[PDB]
Amino acid sequence: ALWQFRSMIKCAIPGSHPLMDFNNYGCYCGLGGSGTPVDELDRCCETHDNCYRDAKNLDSCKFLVDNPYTESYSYSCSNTEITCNSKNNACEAFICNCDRNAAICFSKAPYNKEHKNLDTKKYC
């Protein structure tokens, strides 16, 4: 679920404020997306969007109000490491893995200040 993704990010990047740092970044970090990501971080965001689009295209999973962000799973944080709980159901595990891969991706991508609040209508 959305709150857990924010906290997965804090797990992976202890000095981060997820909503301030990664929301409305580039062309994909934020609601929807368009065009081509502008850097690796932005590209982590598109892959996450894409990862969410695949979960919805799973016939077995009917997410509340069709949003995978509503679906809570179980995970833990230790010393920078995210672990998605094996007891998560197949749909919760898919979402957990979207969020974890994204938090791990964010932690490794260069953060370019200039791509925060990008002019998307122009550059995306």
Ligand SMILES: COc1ccc2cc3[n+](cc2c1OC)CCc1cc2c(cc1-3)OCO2
């Ligand atoms: C579901 O309604 C909401 C509610 C909140 C939302 C807030 C975020 N997104 C859409 C939202 C949304 O739309 C689906 C998409 C991506 C994203 C990445 C982030 C983040 C927040 C969000 O902070 C950490 O990096």
Ligand SMILES: [Ca+2]
């Ligand atoms: Ca997005």
Ligand SMILES: [Ca+2]
């Ligand atoms: Ca759940």
